[PDB]
Design an enzyme around this catalytic site. Structure first.
Site, PDB file in Angstrom:
ATOM      1  N   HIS A  47       0.824  -1.208   0.000  1.00  0.00           N
ATOM      2  CA  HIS A  47       0.000   0.000   0.000  1.00  0.00           C
ATOM      3  C   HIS A  47       0.859   1.260   0.000  1.00  0.00           C
ATOM      4  CE1 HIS A  47      -2.991   2.906   1.871  1.00  0.00           C
ATOM      5  NE2 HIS A  47      -3.658   2.425   0.837  1.00  0.00           N
ATOM      6  N   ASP A  89      -6.155   1.793  -2.350  1.00  0.00           N
ATOM      7  CA  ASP A  89      -6.892   1.438  -1.142  1.00  0.00           C
ATOM      8  C   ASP A  89      -7.666   0.139  -1.328  1.00  0.00           C
ATOM      9  OD1 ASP A  89      -5.866   3.756  -0.135  1.00  0.00           O
ATOM     10  OD2 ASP A  89      -7.777   4.824   0.003  1.00  0.00           O
TER      11      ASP A  89
END
EC number: 3.1.1.4
Lengths: 121, 121
Positions: A47, A89
């Protein structure tokens, strides 16, 4: 933005980000300072790398649009930055879900003295 | 335990810990590495110091008893460690609430390059 990322995490994992993921392991829970301990811990590494590719964006504060179709997150219309942040996300929240069965509660608030040095994207 | 601390934070502040407090400033949001930027940030510093006084306890995993029927957290019966941990958690959640008036959204995901070196308890 981070609020939307947290909504994704709750919806996909059934757990609130705190403490289950914000305190997890050597990367999620130690500010990305340590080598990931398992697959869940690596989701946070990916991420950060995903955000790191968005040099002209503000991934933490930019609000994007998305919906859910057939159980899948669909990143909606918006600026190029909004769509790309959303995809980061989405990928991380699904990554958390995919590794629920190797999630270890004893990695929450893991003692960082036993963490190893971290690698780059 | 950490789950209970997060519940206290939500009940006292009306905000979930992520992202409003887990990413806040230079101490809450930077793993205790920077000096607290304001009163909200200092709440996390005091919380860590409070845990540090409990050398005979496991503040992150021990589950205690408490109630909040009349708008005030009341730590209930339990082991001495359970009550001391509960009091640390209560004081931090109340600290967040009492300083909401100076909470700054721009301290969420604060750039740690502008964080300064921190002090001891």
């Amino acid at each position: 933005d981070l609020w939307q990322f947290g909504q994704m995490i709750l919806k996909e994992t059934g757990k609130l980000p705190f403490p289950y993921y914000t305190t997890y392991g050597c990367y999620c829970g130690w500010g990305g300072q340590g080598q990931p301990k398992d697959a869940t811990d690596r989701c946070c590494f990916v991420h950060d790398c995903c955000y790191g590719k968005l040099t002209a964006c503000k991934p933490k504060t930019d609000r994007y649009s998305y919906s859910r179709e057939n159980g899948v997150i669909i990143c909606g219309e918006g600026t190029p930055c909004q769509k790309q942040i959303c995809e980061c996300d989405k990928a991380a929240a699904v990554c958390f879900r995919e590794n629920l069965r190797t999630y270890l509660a004893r990695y929450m608030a893991y003692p960082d003295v036993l963490c190893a040095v971290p690698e780059k994207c």
